[PDB]
Amino acid sequence: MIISEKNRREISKYLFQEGVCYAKKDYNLAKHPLIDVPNLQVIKLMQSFKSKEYVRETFAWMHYYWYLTNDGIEFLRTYLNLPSEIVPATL
């Protein structure tokens, strides 16, 4: 899916800073409740991350639940150019 660079940066930043993220299955929602990006782009970016094992996806009662993995943490650290010391708030 075509995603603006700023939107992808914001999504990745939020995911790494928090380590978890949810999303209601609403493709046409204007903005994600926690992220300024539209809901569809957040859902599809998380699906892309899950497809290559960067995140774990759980679905229940029309909602998504994404949890970052070690490979996902490494990818986000490399891509965001953050120092190795900084880690997701969950740890």
Partner 1 sequence: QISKKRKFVADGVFFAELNEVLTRELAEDGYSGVEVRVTPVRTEIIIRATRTQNVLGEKGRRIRELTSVVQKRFKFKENSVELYAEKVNNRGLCAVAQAESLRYKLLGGLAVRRACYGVLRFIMESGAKGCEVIVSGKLRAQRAKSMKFKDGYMISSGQPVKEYIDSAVRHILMRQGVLGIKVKIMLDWDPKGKQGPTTPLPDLVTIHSPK
Partner 2 sequence: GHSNIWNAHPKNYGPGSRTCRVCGNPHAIIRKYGLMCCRQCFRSNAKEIGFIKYR
Residues that bind partner 2 (CB under 8 A): 25, 28, 61-62
The beta strands (E) that lie in 1-91 are given as 20-24, 55-59, 63-68
Q: Which does 51 bind (CB under 5 to 8 A by kind): partner 2, partner 1, none?
A: none
Cβ proximity of 10 and 37 under 8 Å: yes
Residue 69 interacting with partner 1 (CB under 8 A): no
What is d(CA 32, CA 1) in angstroms, rounded to the nearest whole number?
17
The minimum distance between CB 2 and partner 1, in angstroms, equals 27
Contacting positions for partner 1 (CB under 8 A): 18-22, 34, 58-61, 63, 65, 67, 89-91
